[PDB]
Amino acid sequence: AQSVPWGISRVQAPAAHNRGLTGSGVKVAVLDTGISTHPDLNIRGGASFVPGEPSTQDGNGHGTHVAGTIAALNNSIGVLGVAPSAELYAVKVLGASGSGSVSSIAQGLEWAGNNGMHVANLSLGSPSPSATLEQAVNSATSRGVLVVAASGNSGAGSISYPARYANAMAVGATDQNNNRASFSQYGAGLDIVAPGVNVQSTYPGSTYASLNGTSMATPHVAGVAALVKQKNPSWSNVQIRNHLKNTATGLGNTNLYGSGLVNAEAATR
Numbered sequence: 652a653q654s655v656p657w658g659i660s661r662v663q664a665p666a667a668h669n670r671g672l673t674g675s676g677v678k679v680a681v682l683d684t685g686i687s688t689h690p691d692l693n694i695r696g697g698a699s700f701v702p703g704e705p706s707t708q709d710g711n712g713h714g715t716h717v718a719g720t721i722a723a724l725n726n727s728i729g730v731l732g733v734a735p736s737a738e739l740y741a742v743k744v745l746g747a748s749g750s751g752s753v754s755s756i757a758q759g760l761e762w763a764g765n766n767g768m769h770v771a772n773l774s775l776g777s778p779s780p781s782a783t784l785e786q787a788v789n790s791a792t793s794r795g796v797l798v799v800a801a802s803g804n805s806g807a808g809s810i811s812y813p814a815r816y817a818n819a820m821a822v823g824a825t826d827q828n829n830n831r832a833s834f835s836q837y838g839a840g841l842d843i844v845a846p847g848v849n850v851q852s853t854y855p856g857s858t859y860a861s862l863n864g865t866s867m868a869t870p871h872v873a874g875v876a877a878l879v880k881q882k883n884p885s886w887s888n889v890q891i892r893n894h895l896k897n898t899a900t901g902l903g904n905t906n907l908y909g910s911g912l913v914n915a916e917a918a919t920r
């Protein structure tokens with residue numbers, strides 16, 4: 652049958668689902684190693700920005716996993732995503748090695764802006780700031796896209812870029828008790844945290860797998876952002892953002908946690 656991973660219950664996605672919020676009518680770009688076609692996924696489109704590589708054909712597994720968390724289908728198989736009806740686009744910016752270049756990340760961000768994406772999930776990062784990155788972060792945002800980015804996995808009391816950027820919602824990871832995960836980068840520019848430990852999701856070769864990483868926390872917020880937008884169609888990126896942070900369960904220290912745990916019930920009241 653279908654299983655509901657611990658993180659989707661934790662984020663309280665089902666309660667939102669009970670009120671009919673599935674993420675329908677919302678377009679989500681996933682900037683990653685690609686998305687492979689899988690029985691429990693609905694991929695609407697995408698593009699590849701990797702010299703040498705397809706799109707949806709993920710040679711890594713990381714993008715496929717990420718997308719699983721945001722939207723794997725509510726059915727009697729595999730898993731269930733936060734936003735089971737969200738329109739997924741595979742924006743391939745990282746190759747099978749799982750690395751890219753800031754330009755590949757920037758042209759993906761351009762794609763989203765020119766394609767009308769409501770959400771942009773960037774489960775990637777660098778210790779280094781980039782001019783080409785915050786610019787694209789910036790256009791995407793004028794164009795109405797909500798950039799969701801991972802804090803990083805060094806455990807440093809600082810955050811990675813694009814996350815550091817005022818222009819991006821920065822997402823850190825918690826473990827199963829709701830404590831920050833050891834690798835989870837915190838500090839300045841940290842907006843919120845979501846489940847990032849032992850997260851089971853969709854994976855190439857029509858299988859499922861468990862991964863750890865702030866890279867797994869990010870899709871959880873992209874998902875929530877989709878539910879709110881379905882419920883408040885008129886809202887802009889900045890509105891969804893502030894409401895997502897404001898309805899979070901405070902885990903009492905905005906330095907380690909930003910607002911606290913994203914909360915779909917609460918965020919959709």
Ligand SMILES: [Ca+2]
Nearest residue numbers: 724726728730
């Ligand atoms: Ca499923």
Ligand SMILES: [Ca+2]
Nearest residue numbers: 814819821840
């Ligand atoms: Ca930020």
